[PDB]
Amino acid sequence: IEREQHHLIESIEKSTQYMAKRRIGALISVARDTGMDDYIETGIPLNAKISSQLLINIFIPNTPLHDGAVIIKGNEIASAASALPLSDSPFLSKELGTRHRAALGISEVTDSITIVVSEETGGISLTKGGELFRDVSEEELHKILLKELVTVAKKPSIF
Amino acid sequence: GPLGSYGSRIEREQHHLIESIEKSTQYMAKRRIGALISVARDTGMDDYIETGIPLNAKISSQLLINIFIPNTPLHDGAVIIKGNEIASAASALPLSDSPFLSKELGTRHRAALGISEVTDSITIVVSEETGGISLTKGGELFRDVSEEELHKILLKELVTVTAKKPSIFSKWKGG
Ligand SMILES: OC[C@H]1O[C@@](CO)(O[C@H]2O[C@H](CO)[C@@H](O)[C@H](O)[C@H]2O)[C@@H](O)[C@@H]1O
Ligand SMILES: [Cl-]
Ligand SMILES: [Cl-]
Ligand SMILES: [Cl-]
Ligand SMILES: [Cl-]
Ligand SMILES: [Cl-]
Ligand SMILES: [Cl-]
Ligand SMILES: [Cl-]
Ligand SMILES: [Cl-]
Structure with a gap:
């Protein structure tokens, strides 16, 4: 369903934009x-409609749902405050903490796309297949989410 | 099921709803966080429901608390619980015009009273001014109830009494 996928992308972008300006730490795994x-079962079950509003409320500091991962599965926010594995990568910059290391860790054992907001800088990062793309721009975030979450790769790969 | 193995599914969902309301309101009350939950x-x-932001979410004390955090997108209005879901947040409810409602009470109490006048909803309010917990039903207000009175009214009004032995068997519902 192309329509739900474009809404998912917009919901991620708007929520992370808001958290980034406020240096609110956040972790969303798709x-x-x-x-x-x-x-999903390690967390608090939500099975909720996807919205930018619910994503923002989830991550407000010192609240019951903020301390852990949101996992998005299908067309729902499946859970919040979920556990994820920690990477032992030594290549990860020293100013990045356990949130970035959790995002990297899940990318090592799944084909999930994971979006991170830094509580220190408000920079937005992405992980995929054991690798981290650090401090992406709004345009780069949109381009990677479109490619990786919207199935309609139809064109020749070179492009 | 996910909730447990005692009694019927409906019973367990209703007891979980009650506990979710009690825990969430206790947390908000001590922090004087305003809240408005209509069942x-x-x-x-x-x-x-259509005036709010749709959630269609599993009920938890945690999600109720996060919804009502001040100055957030979801806090400004009513949570409506329908079936076994948090159906929406930041919903608009009608305001009561009653002049018998104390002027010391704010817009949440007037919305809670208003909905109770035109539905058989049970509505719970946490006052941001006093931290008191109130309840409305059928045009009446129960003001600043104790934890014990809250439990007693929620049990009576929200838990369907079901037969004992028949409750242990799950019926087929097409799945
Ligand atoms: O607990 C409230 C919740 O229960 C439901 C069924 O899931 O309502 C049933 O039980 C109520 C209280 O015992 C009754 O008021 C009602 O008539 C009955 O449908 C939900 O509709 C309600 O939100
Ligand atoms: Cl469409
Ligand atoms: Cl961080
Ligand atoms: Cl960064
Ligand atoms: Cl159950
Ligand atoms: Cl508390
Ligand atoms: Cl109030
Ligand atoms: Cl009390
Ligand atoms: Cl008491």
């Missing part, structure tokens, strides 16, 4: 082909 |  059921 | 019963509240 499940793809590999199952994330065991990580 | 639909036999009366449709679909039109008020």
Whole structure:
């Protein structure tokens, strides 16, 4: 369903834009082909409609839902305050803490796309397949989410 | 099921709803966080659901608390609970015109009273001024109730009494 996927992307972009300006730390993992059921069950179940508003309310500091991962599965916010594994990568910059290391860790054992907001700088990062793309612009964020979450790769790969 | 193995599914969902309300209101009350939670019963509240932001979410004390954090997108209005979901947040409810409602009470109390006049909803209010917990039902206000009185009214009004042995067997619902 192309329509739900474009809404998902917009919801991620607007919520992370708001948190970034406020240096609110956040972690959103979007499940793809590999199952994330065991990580979903570690958290508080929501099974909620996706909206930028609900994503922002989830991550407000010192609230019951903020301390852990949001996992998006199908067309729902499946859970909040979920556990994710921590990467032991030594290549990760020293100013990045356990949130970035959790995002990297999940990307190492799933094909999920994970978006991170830094509580120190408000920079936005992405992880995929054991790798981190640090401090992306608004345009780069949009381009990678469109490519990785909207199925309609139809054109020749070179482009 | 997910909730537990005792009694019927409906019973467990209703006891979880009650506990979710009690825990969330206790947390908000000590922080003087304003809150307004309306539980639909036999009366449709679909039109008020449509005024809010849709959530269609599993009920938890945690989600109720996060919804009402001040100065957030979801806090400004009513949560409406319908079936076994948090249907919407930041919904508009009608205001009561009653002059019998104390002027010391704010817009949340007047919205809670207003909905209770045209539905058989149970509505819970946390006052941002006093931290008191209030309840409305059928045009009446129960003001600044104790934890014990809150539990007693929620049990009576929100838990369907069901037969004992019949409750342990799950019925087929097409799945
Ligand atoms: O607990 C409130 C919740 O229960 C439901 C059924 O899931 O309502 C049923 O039980 C109520 C209280 O015992 C009754 O008022 C009602 O008539 C009955 O449908 C939900 O509709 C309600 O939100
Ligand atoms: Cl469409
Ligand atoms: Cl951080
Ligand atoms: Cl950064
Ligand atoms: Cl259950
Ligand atoms: Cl508390
Ligand atoms: Cl108030
Ligand atoms: Cl008390
Ligand atoms: Cl008491």
